[PDB]
Design a protein around this ligand. Sequence first.
Ligand SMILES: Nc1ncnc2c1ncn2[C@@H]1O[C@H](COP(=O)(O)OP(=O)(O)O)[C@@H](O)[C@H]1O
Lengths: 96, 67, 96, 68, 25, 89, 149
Amino acid sequence: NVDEVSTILVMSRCGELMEDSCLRKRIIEEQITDCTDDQFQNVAANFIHLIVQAFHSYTGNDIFALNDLIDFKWPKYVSRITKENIFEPLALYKSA
Amino acid sequence: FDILCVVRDLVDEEADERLATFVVDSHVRSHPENARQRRLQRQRKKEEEISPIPQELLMKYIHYART
Amino acid sequence: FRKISRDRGIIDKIISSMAPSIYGHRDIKTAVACSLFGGVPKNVNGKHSIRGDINVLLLGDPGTAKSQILKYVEKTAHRAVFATGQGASAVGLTAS
Amino acid sequence: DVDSINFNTLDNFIILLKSAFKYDHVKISLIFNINTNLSNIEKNLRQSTIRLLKRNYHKLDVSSNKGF
Amino acid sequence: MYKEKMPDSQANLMDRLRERERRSA
Amino acid sequence: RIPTVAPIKLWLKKDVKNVWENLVQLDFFTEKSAVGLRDNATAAFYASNYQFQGTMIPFDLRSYQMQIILQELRRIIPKSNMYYSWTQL
Amino acid sequence: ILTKEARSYLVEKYKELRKDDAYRITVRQLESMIRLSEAIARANCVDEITPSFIAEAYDLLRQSTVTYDKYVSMMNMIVRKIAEVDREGAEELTAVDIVDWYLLQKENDLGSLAEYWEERRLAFKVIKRLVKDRILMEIHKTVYVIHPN
Ligand SMILES: Nc1ncnc2c1ncn2[C@@H]1O[C@H](COP(=O)(O)OP(=O)(O)O)[C@@H](O)[C@H]1O
């Protein structure tokens, strides 16, 4: 089910995306001293939920298709993360 | 006949916009609103707003040319 | 009249003067004006004759003011008669 | 010559080669000779395989004509 | 139009409906 | 059928392709002359050899037939679905 | 009498209709739109033909649990309210914020104090239906924003 797919992708890709090189480069560039792995997971979960709610009708309740969108849009989504978007996912969505 | 005028009601954004903005102003003009002289002056002002020749003069000109 | 006649390019003013509230259709307005002014009924040597008036047919789709133009010729020409196709009879048009 | 290749067979072959990633000692590179554009590939291949290709791809115009 | 932009009434909207009701008769 | 403004996305033809593929994977659609699974290996060899017309014609022009009739759709689709009103003609 | 901005609104809406026939709409339908706006204002005390009247005439000629019309009426209001704060950049709206605003917009149409809770509950149900249709996107307050569709 849609809820099942949403929970499974969050359970799966969170640790995969919490440790990618691009985000830890951008954190250094943006000097995010208060960033923690708990907030890292929350940012990844927000990303995944946003993709799911935007593209479930496009992909269906399919794990494989959503994974590839999560991989592709992840660099470009990271490029819009700045000092102002650490705590407001709404603003990051607006930028993205 | 001598002249045959064929008309197509084909659709186009620019032509339709021009036609609609002309028609709406025509319907604004034709709507109602020495007083005789003043009202004749206002009517001729509205005629000038849309035609280069006053229409009574045009009628007389046509009659004179035909005569 | 002679003051008006000397204006350069008087023909365009006359053509633009026909039915001002009707937008466009300049190729029809010119024909209407030409039929209003008409030509010369040259009764050459008496024994031969040529009609002096121009006949105009307005053919087109509905919503093209093929009818309201006649409601300008009827109000502009010195003597105009208006009839509808099905509201006329052969006896009625010609002679009774 | 990609355009003349049966795209269903190509898609199945790509999925087959995908199984090779379980081996730690194998690396695979793909060269696509395209005549017109990415449009034919996007039309003919399944949208699942396109996502497999797109994760790491490069685009290069090697035509003999380039801005005079 | 959008004239009713900020009529930030309290729970007095229930009393407003009471005014609507009790005098309609 | 919606009131207008005083001063429901039509999805692009390209994004629909994934939905079209999903509807063929899940056996709702089928080809016009789909023989399906062959009975024996000898016929299966020939089937894997021969290339049908459906393997060459464009993606958007491949004819399909339906396994579920609209009567069953209206019987199964909940009335609370926003496209239930379109289940009939 | 036609208002000046009503002319621009009318030509825009006429082009919108003319695009859809690529019966077929002619200029007679533009005159009909003017005539129907005139008739609607003729059933009212104001001669100013506001764009709302032309919108109503456009809807009446172009269109040729909870009831259909009552539900669809709230959708335009809520979408326009959210698009307003989209342009303003103000704080985003929760479900309660939308419900209270919508009730304020229809204070004069309510019949009784009992109908207050009925309409509030109907509004929440309509919000849930819209979310199920993905015309509104829920983000985290429980923030509702215009869906990417
Ligand atoms: N070119 C045009 N410019 C302005 N108004 C027009 C034009 N064509 C048609 N109209 C409007 O549409 C109506 C057409 O009436 P009518 O002459 O009976 O149409 P038709 O004879 O072409 O079927 C007129 O009242 C006129 O106001």
